[PDB]
Amino acid sequence: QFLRTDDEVVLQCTATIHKEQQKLCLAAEGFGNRLCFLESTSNSKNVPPDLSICTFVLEQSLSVRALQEMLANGHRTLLYGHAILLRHSYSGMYLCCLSTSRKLAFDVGLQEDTTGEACWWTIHPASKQRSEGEKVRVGDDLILVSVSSERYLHLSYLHVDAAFQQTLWSVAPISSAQGYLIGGDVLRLLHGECLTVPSGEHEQRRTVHYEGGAVSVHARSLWRLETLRVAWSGSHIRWGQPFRLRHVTTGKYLSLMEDKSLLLMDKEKADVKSTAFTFRSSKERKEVDGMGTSEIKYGDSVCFIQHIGTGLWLTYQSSIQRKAIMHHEGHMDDGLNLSRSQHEESRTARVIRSTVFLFNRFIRGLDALSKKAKASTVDLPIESVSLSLQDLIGYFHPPDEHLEHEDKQNRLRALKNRQNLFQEEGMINLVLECIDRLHVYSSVAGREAGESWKSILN
């Protein structure tokens, strides 16, 4: 009804580019990338959009006077004239304005710190039907204005930049019960032993197996229930609605071809029903406009998977390679138990393939120069990479001395988890390949760009 603080919301601007609507969402990446862009959700039935890089959290909402006062030094309901602080639901970095250029428009991207007037945006109405002061309503169309740059959050012609010209911004509430499911989480496919995917050294891992032991603990067995709903996508998850199963460690959507094979095919190969799934109570409403009703507990759960395009039951047959396939009736083994993962396990998994996609653009991009001279490969990113190592050093920063002994042993424990979930996925082997490919020269190529060859190697 009305937005509050600690609410998950997305921003969204619309463009009619040659009689074709695009309701494209604002999305920033974080952890190596300091700039925002757009994400298409119009073709949500034929290409999946990302969700974890576009949902925001309204951290605070103050008046302008108190904000300048603090800068000189429950839940509120937002008012058309408050100034807000939006933080990324994944990266934990606040959305702000940047002093770069891509005119007099400034570029929009995340940043670490919150102090200064950069990270604050004053809401504004955009029609005669609303005016100043009153409470925000859900589904409104509004304006965002920076405090520091004194500009509007503009969509240009796809540079999203803080400009002096306006653009509407549809907002949409996402989330707001412990132990119950919430739309968009990552969790474990427990058996009674969990579902897995094969290890490294590549098949493109496209099979699906059940395994046992500590491999479920590691970063292979992670799956994200990306629900097709736009508004209130972070509701509770009930029986009957469809949801694509996304792999988290590699980003390949589970799409059943019961005609052909069980495939984790790639991004744009997800239709509506070829990859949808649902949960049945046995093995034989329509919509809730809210955060949902409390459906599925975690330990008290025996959940039965069923495809939408076929309608059969995935059950295993008679290493541990009991590869499960769709059966018409199955056995009494499709009562799958559930358990959610943690917030640092979700954090570690997402930063693996955000970098694995980047280092392969620096292995094969540097294997393009492994010939004599091609010189046409501009896909050898330097500023996109030499920034991305500084975050992964700071991600593995050992905790300082002067700290509380109940806080160090929290920081030292979460450090050892980050070192183990990088060990199994072969990140240690994946960097040593990159030290090989750069140890061919002695300080190269066109030596105007890659003059930072030593600092990348160092």
């Binding site: 007099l104 004194e150 002096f164």
Partner: peptide, 26 residues
Amino acid sequence: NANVVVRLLIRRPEGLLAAMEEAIKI
């Protein structure tokens, strides 16, 4: 009055090294 119309003229249009010198020839 300093803080007004420059708060307006951001939203109005009005490189400019090309205009100021080519007007000598015109």
